[PDB]
Amino acid sequence: QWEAGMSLLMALVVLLIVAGNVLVIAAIGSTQRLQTLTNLFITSLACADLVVGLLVVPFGATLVVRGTWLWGSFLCELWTSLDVLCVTASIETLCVIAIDRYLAITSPFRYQSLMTRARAKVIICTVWAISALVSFLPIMMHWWRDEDPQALKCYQDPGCCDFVTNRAYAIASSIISFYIPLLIMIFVALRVYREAKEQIREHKALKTLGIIMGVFTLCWLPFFLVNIVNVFNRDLVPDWLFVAFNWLGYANSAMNPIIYCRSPDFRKAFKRLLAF
Amino acid sequence: WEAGMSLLMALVVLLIVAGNVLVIAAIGSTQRLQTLTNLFITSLACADLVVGLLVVPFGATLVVRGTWLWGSFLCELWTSLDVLCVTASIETLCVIAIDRYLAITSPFRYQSLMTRARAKVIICTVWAISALVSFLPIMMHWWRDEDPQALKCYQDPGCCDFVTNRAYAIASSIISFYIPLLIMIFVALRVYREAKEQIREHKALKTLGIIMGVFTLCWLPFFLVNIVNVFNRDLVPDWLFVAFNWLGYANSAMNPIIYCRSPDFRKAFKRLLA
Numbered sequence: 001q002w003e004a005g006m007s008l009l010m011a012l013v014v015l016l017i018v019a020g021n022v023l024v025i026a027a028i029g030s031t032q033r034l035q036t037l038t039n040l041f042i043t044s045l046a047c048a049d050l051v052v053g054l055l056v057v058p059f060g061a062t063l064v065v066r067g068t069w070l071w072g073s074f075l076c077e078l079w080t081s082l083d084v085l086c087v088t089a090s091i092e093t094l095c096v097i098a099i100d101r102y103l104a105i106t107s108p109f110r111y112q113s114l115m116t117r118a119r120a121k122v123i124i125c126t127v128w129a130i131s132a133l134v135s136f137l138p139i140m141m142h143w144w145r146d147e148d149p150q151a152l153k154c155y156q157d158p159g160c161c162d163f164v165t166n167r168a169y170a171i172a173s174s175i176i177s178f179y180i181p182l183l184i185m186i187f188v189a190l191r192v193y194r195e196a197k198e199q200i201r202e203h204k205a206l207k208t209l210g211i212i213m214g215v216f217t218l219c220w221l222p223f224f225l226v227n228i229v230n231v232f233n234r235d236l237v238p239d240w241l242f243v244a245f246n247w248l249g250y251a252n253s254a255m256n257p258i259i260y261c262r263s264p265d266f267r268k269a270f271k272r273l274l275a276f
Numbered sequence: 277w278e279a280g281m282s283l284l285m286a287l288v289v290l291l292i293v294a295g296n297v298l299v300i301a302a303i304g305s306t307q308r309l310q311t312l313t314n315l316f317i318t319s320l321a322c323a324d325l326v327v328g329l330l331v332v333p334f335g336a337t338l339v340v341r342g343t344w345l346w347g348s349f350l351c352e353l354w355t356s357l358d359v360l361c362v363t364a365s366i367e368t369l370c371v372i373a374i375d376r377y378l379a380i381t382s383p384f385r386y387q388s389l390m391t392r393a394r395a396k397v398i399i400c401t402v403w404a405i406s407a408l409v410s411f412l413p414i415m416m417h418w419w420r421d422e423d424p425q426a427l428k429c430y431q432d433p434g435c436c437d438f439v440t441n442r443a444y445a446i447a448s449s450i451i452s453f454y455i456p457l458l459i460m461i462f463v464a465l466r467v468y469r470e471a472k473e474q475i476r477e478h479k480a481l482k483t484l485g486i487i488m489g490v491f492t493l494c495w496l497p498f499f500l501v502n503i504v505n506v507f508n509r510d511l512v513p514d515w516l517f518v519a520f521n522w523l524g525y526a527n528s529a530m531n532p533i534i535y536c537r538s539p540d541f542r543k544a545f546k547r548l549l550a
């Protein structure tokens with residue numbers, strides 16, 4: 001009945017993630033004072049955290065509690081597709097956020113005229129399409145599959161939902177969905193910092209964004225590191241820690257609304273909807 | 277430059293096809309030219325073979341007759357292949373840089389991991405990724421714009437203009453060209469710093485460098501005016517687009533020339549030519 005306490009903490013995180021990110025989306029929707037361009041990209045980020053609290057983690061919980069997949073081969077693949085799309089769309093969006101800031105800070109005039117809200121939406125949409133293209137389709141086209149006896153065994157057990165991939169796909173996709181967008185964000189972000197210094201409230205906002213980014217990297221990097229190591233030497237790091245780290249990635253989805261508590265704005269808008 | 281340019285243009289199809297067919301055959305004869313690096317060179321020559329046999333010949337009928345003569349589907353397949361090949365090339369050049377850099381700083385781990393079977397896997401992974409970001413948005417019509425101008429071009433089968441929306445135009449460019457480019461350069465610069473700090477291998481590295489420089493010089497213009505049409509669609513004249521685009525095609529004819537720098541290819545080109 002260890003199953004019962006697990007369904008309690010699990011149910012609890014789903015609550016954090018879902019409540020916190022609905023609060024964000026609603027606060028920004030409420031105040032137009034809170035409606036800036038930056039916050040448009042933040043909403044995009046919130047939505048990807050929502051999908052996780054609503055779809056990814058719920059089914060993911062059953063998998064960890066029962067050590068087996070109850071939902072069938074098709075939903076297994078679908079679930080996996082969704083999981084990957086959400087992490088790709090996050091880091092891709094954090095990228096945009098950084099580059100957006102770096103442009104506003106260096107080219108303030110050429111920035112205001114070119115950058116409206118209709119375009120940020122067009123940009124958000126393009127990140128989700130790019131994210132769908134590089135991480136949803138391939139999984140749904142079955143390119144991730146291995147040829148190994150053990151792999152084929154898994155693909156035929158509706159109870160097995162191990163993301164057992166071929167090594168080509170393991171490298172290509174971690175680089176393409178995570179590493180590249182990560183490097184880019186790290187670089188562009190560093191630059192924004194130097195610029196902000198060569199300029200010394202706006203900074204508190206810039207710092208919050210850096211924190212959002214830094215926590216993202218800490219929460220997900222262990223998993224993508226372990227991912228590559230595995231490609232080289234399959235039995236050098238224990239399956240359970242593989243799972244531990246992926247859950248650290250999932251938990252990130254609840255840290256954002258928490259971090260936004262640094263703001264007076266977000267602090268006075270968080271308490272208007274919770275009724276105080 | 278006008279007599280010169282004119283001759284080159286009357287010779288490109290021949291120059292690209294015969295020259296790349298020739299690179300392929302040389303690498304496949306002289307087992308002394310059979311090395312990991314040269315397998316990537318071969319992938320690079322197939323990208324070029326395809327440009328020489330499918331892309332350029334049909335593009336020639338278009339620029340000359342002034343109209344698309346083959347139907348709207350062949351038009352969208354054509355644009356597809358054209359996008360594929362640029363994408364596969366610059367990705368393959370990326371892999372060639374990373375491969376060399378790694379063969380030069382971790383040579384043991386390099387000799388132990390990198391094999392021919394492995395390299396082939398890497399080639400196909402690259403071609404796969406390339407069809408993904410080039411064929412697939414075309415088959416889902418993600419490239420299409422809403423403008424009546426664009427719309428009349430979609431009805432005219434005799435019109436094969438690649439009129440795309442701004443979202444697509446920027447994204448497909450960042451993804452097919454600029455990112456792979458930025459990586460290839462940062463990596464090639466690292467490899468230069470290593471080959472330097474380290475002093476016939478440097479002659480083979482200098483050719484790889486020339487291949488990567490000429491590729492950049494040949495395509496960067498076309499992608500620059502491509503970002504410019506995004507800002508203002510009237511700010512740059514069609515003729516300048518055609519020229520820059522053909523500058524890039526002509527790139528498919530340069531490589532075999534450049535390899536004549538090596539004595540092995542030269543030797544082997546001459547054997548092959550009776």
Ligand SMILES: CC(C)(C)NC[C@H](O)COc1cccc2c1CC(C#N)=N2
Nearest residue numbers: 080083084087163165170173174177246
């Ligand atoms: C239960 C599973 C394993 C589905 N969790 C997936 C993880 O949340 C997201 O992991 C990934 C995200 C993007 C790209 C990826 C990736 C894993 C691999 C691999 N090879 N490539």
Ligand SMILES: CC(C)(C)NC[C@H](O)COc1cccc2c1CC(C#N)=N2
Nearest residue numbers: 355358359362363438440445448449452
């Ligand atoms: C005649 C046409 C116009 C068909 N030539 C296409 C060009 O050779 C290939 O250009 C491209 C290569 C890769 C990615 C690209 C791209 C053009 C765009 C755009 N937007 N995205």
Ligand SMILES: CCCCCCCCS[C@@H]1O[C@H](CO)[C@@H](O)[C@H](O)[C@H]1O
Nearest residue numbers: 134138143168169172173400401404
């Ligand atoms: C982010 C998307 C990454 C996609 C990577 C796809 C990799 C396929 S590898 C390789 O392809 C060959 C066919 O071309 C098959 O014959 C081999 O059996 C297979 O192992």
Ligand SMILES: CCCCCCCCS[C@@H]1O[C@H](CO)[C@@H](O)[C@H](O)[C@H]1O
Nearest residue numbers: 098189192193196203206207209210
């Ligand atoms: C996306 C990139 C985000 C970059 C964020 C930079 C935030 C800088 S806060 C600033 O830092 C100074 C030291 O540099 C301190 O002395 C100040 O007291 C403090 O207010």
Ligand SMILES: CCCCCCCCS[C@@H]1O[C@H](CO)[C@@H](O)[C@H](O)[C@H]1O
Nearest residue numbers: 349352353354356411414415416417
């Ligand atoms: C590997 C194929 C690359 C094709 C590039 C051009 C795609 C044009 S859209 C494509 O046109 C077909 C014919 O109309 C339809 O049958 C398909 O459903 C549709 O998606």
Ligand SMILES: CCCCCCCCS[C@@H]1O[C@H](CO)[C@@H](O)[C@H](O)[C@H]1O
Nearest residue numbers: 126129417418420441443444447448
């Ligand atoms: C690597 C290339 C990425 C391109 C990403 C997708 C396009 C974002 S804009 C949008 O996409 C539609 C639906 O597909 C078109 O029908 C519309 O007219 C167009 O305005």
Ligand SMILES: CCCCCCCCS[C@@H]1O[C@H](CO)[C@@H](O)[C@H](O)[C@H]1O
Nearest residue numbers: 373464467468471472481482484485
């Ligand atoms: C990515 C593969 C190509 C990286 C760049 C390779 C070519 C330059 S190496 C460089 O060439 C010089 C002459 O120009 C020599 O004098 C130096 O000793 C040597 O170190």
Ligand SMILES: CCCCCCCCCC
Nearest residue numbers: 092095176180181451455
């Ligand atoms: C604009 C955000 C950058 C995401 C690029 C995706 C990487 C694919 C290139 C190989």
Ligand code: NA
Nearest residue numbers: 154155157160
């Ligand atoms: Na299964």
Ligand code: NA
Nearest residue numbers: 429432433435
């Ligand atoms: Na047409």
